[PDB]
């Protein structure tokens, strides 16, 4: 199962030594097995006997086919998507930086759009810790 | 400890530790990608030296027509058990 095709294949092999049973005679026909079958190999004497079964299922699909995807614009460091232009709410909201007390978290500003969708490719979080004397202070370094 | 048993505890100094936070990734859908039907093949085969049979069904979709090919062959030790059936059907759709 991949993005190209679907493949289901099952095989079975049966081997035996059904030799003593190929040597049977039909008294009602007054003729033997292989005589009535008119087959000698594997049938007259009975050699190593085999049975093979094979099942193959293949479906072909296109990796693109019908691809309906949302249009996304990538300029430098932000993805801009032309969402539905419904002029009902405000135009754009700017959330400046905010400092969380009792820690050192630095959240950068954001610009959220109503008509379109703007997302920032990279988000940067500064390092911050606590103030615990004679205790193991867990300092979290910056993450992008 | 010295107050209770005149024996002070050994001093333990447990240093810095570095805890790993794995690089986590969340993948969210963007759009639908529904593949187009091109070909479907189903083959069944049985082999025995008294009976060898093979059926093959092939359903193809080319341009605006679906083709369907059916093969059914069989062989045996009796001179009236070995047959071949073939079927070819083309169905072209033009605006209904």
Nearest CA-CA distance, residue B41 and chain A, Å = 5
Which residue in chain B has the smallest CA separation from A136?
A: B16
Query: Of B31, B39, B79, which has the smallest distance from its Cβ to A69's Cβ?
Result: B31
Nearest CA-CA distance, residue B19 and chain A, Å = 9
Reported resolution, Å:
9.0
Nearest CA-CA distance, residue A37 and chain B, Å = 6
Q: Taking a C-beta distance cutoff of 8 angstroms, is the pair A26, A33 a contact?
A: yes
Query: Positive or negative, the Cα torsion across A123, A126, A130, A133?
Result: positive
Q: What angle do CA B46, B52, B53 make, to 5 degrees?
A: 65
Q: After which residues is chain B broken (C to N over 2.5 A)?
A: none
Q: Is A59's CB within 8 Å of B39's CB?
A: yes
- The CA R_g of chain A, rounded to the nearest whole Å, is 38
Cβ-based neighbours of A66, under 8 Å, separated by 6 or more? B32, B33, B34, B35, B36
Query: Of A43, A57, A70, which has the smallest distance from its Cβ to B31's Cβ?
Result: A70
């Amino acid at each position: 199962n991949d993005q190209e095709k679907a493949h289901l294949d099952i095989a079975g092999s049966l081997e035996g030594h059904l030799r003593f049973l190929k040597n049977i005679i039909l008294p009602v026909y007054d003729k033997s097995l292989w005589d009535f079958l008119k087959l000698d190999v594997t049938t007259s004497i009975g050699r190593r006997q085999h049975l093979r079964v094979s099942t193959a299922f293949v479906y072909t699909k296109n990796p693109n086919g019908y691809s309906f995807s949302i249009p996304v614009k990538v300029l430098a460091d932000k993805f801009i998507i032309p969402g539905l232009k419904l002029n009902d709410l405000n135009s754009v909201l700017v959330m400046p930086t905010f400092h969380v007390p009792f820690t050192d978290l630095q959240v950068p500003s954001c610009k959220l759009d109503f008509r379109e969708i703007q997302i920032y490719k990279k988000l940067r979080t500064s390092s911050f810790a606590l103030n615990l004397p004679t205790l193991p202070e867990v300092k979290f370094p910056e993450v992008d | 400890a010295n107050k209770i048993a005149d024996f002070e505890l050994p001093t333990i100094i447990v240093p810095e530790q570095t805890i790993e936070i794995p690089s986590i990734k969340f993948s969210v859908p963007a759009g639908i990608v529904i593949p187009s039907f091109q070909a479907l093949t189903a083959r069944f085969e049985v082999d025995s030296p008294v009976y060898n049979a093979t059926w093959s069904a092939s359903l193809k979709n080319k341009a605006d027509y679906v083709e369907t090919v059916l093969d059914s062959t069989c062989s045996s030790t009796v001179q009236f058990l070995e047959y071949e059936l073939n079927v070819l059907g083309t169905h072209k759709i033009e605006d209904g």
